[PDB]
Scaffold this motif. Structure first.
Motif: not given
Lengths: 24, 254
Positions: B147-150, B153-155, B161-164
């Motif tokens: 989930x985090x890897x996807x 890139x989604x960010x 910004x927060x996710x990245x």
């Protein structure tokens, strides 16, 4: 502060690059 | 507090981009905004949508790779001291690129696959290498959940910004064993180099690696579209101005 220098330079960069963005 | 401010300013980086379409395909000349921290191919769907009326990009008749952050390409295709305030009135800063079609693919660049999966896989494998350089293994990034890897890139696609920040920090090396640094000259003789800079027992300043920078061939050090003092610390520089792909890019300009 080095970070103040970077903050300043990046803001200026973004300002210059955003100028006339309404044409894009 | 400032590293976050600096990173936010980089994430906000955006350029006026003039996309000249190859007649062979104001639909001939598209005007779009593209962030510095992304790849040009991430905007292909937007380019195709606009012109419902092989292929690759070129700058001044020279094919340009798509696998470098847009901001990095801009730094080496657009050849600073001038502040916005002291800048002549109405200077338009923009990047002009041509979308061309041909029978055979230009030999020096990775071709555009137009599959929507190419960019993400390349980028993720590259962060895997950056992790190798920073930590000695790809453990940190391989430990991310699917989930985090996807979402990482989604960010890039949604500009979250927060996710990245959350994910890039998770995988980012406490204290690098080496710095993932790329040095290049202007693409308008082109030279690129990936020097091995150890952090073990030292705390190099830009001036300290002057030997490596100069081996790429009176010159100004440009990073993230700005000039950097020769006395700044490499680690500091990397930790703050590295691009969205994990690499820190330095462009040498006269």
């Amino acid at each position: 502060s080095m970070d103040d220098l970077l903050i300043r330079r990046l803001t200026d960069r973004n300002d210059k690059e955003a100028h006339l963005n309404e044409l894009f | 507090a400032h590293m976050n401010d600096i990173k936010q300013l980089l994430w906000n980086g955006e350029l006026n981009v003039l996309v000249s379409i190859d007649p062979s395909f104001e639909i001939a000349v598209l005007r779009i905004r593209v962030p510095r921290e992304t790849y040009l191919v991430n905007y292909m769907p937007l380019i195709w949508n606009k012109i419902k009326s092989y292929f690759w990009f070129e700058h001044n008749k020279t094919p340009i790779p798509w696998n470098y952050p847009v901001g990095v390409l801009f730094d080496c295709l657009a050849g600073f001291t001038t502040s916005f305030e002291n800048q002549v009135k109405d200077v338009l800063t923009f990047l002009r690129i041509h979308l061309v079609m041909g029978d055979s693919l230009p030999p020096t660049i990775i071709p555009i696959a137009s599959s929507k999966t190419q960019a993400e896989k390349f980028w993720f494998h590259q962060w895997k290498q950056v992790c190798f350089i920073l930590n000695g293994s790809s453990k940190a990034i391989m430990s991310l959940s699917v989930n985090e890897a996807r979402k990482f890139w989604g960010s890039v696609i949604t500009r979250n910004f927060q996710d990245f920040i959350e994910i890039s920090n998770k995988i980012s090396s406490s204290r690098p064993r080496h710095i993932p640094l790329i040095i290049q000259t202007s693409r308008t003789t082109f030279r690129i180099s990936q020097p091995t800079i150890s952090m073990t027992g030292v705390n190099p300043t830009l001036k300290d690696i002057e030997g490596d920078i100069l081996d790429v061939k009176d010159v100004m050090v440009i990073c993230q579209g700005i000039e950097i003092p020769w006395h700044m610390l490499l680690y500091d520089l990397y930790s703050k101005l590295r691009s969205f792909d994990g690499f820190l890019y330095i462009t040498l300009v006269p």
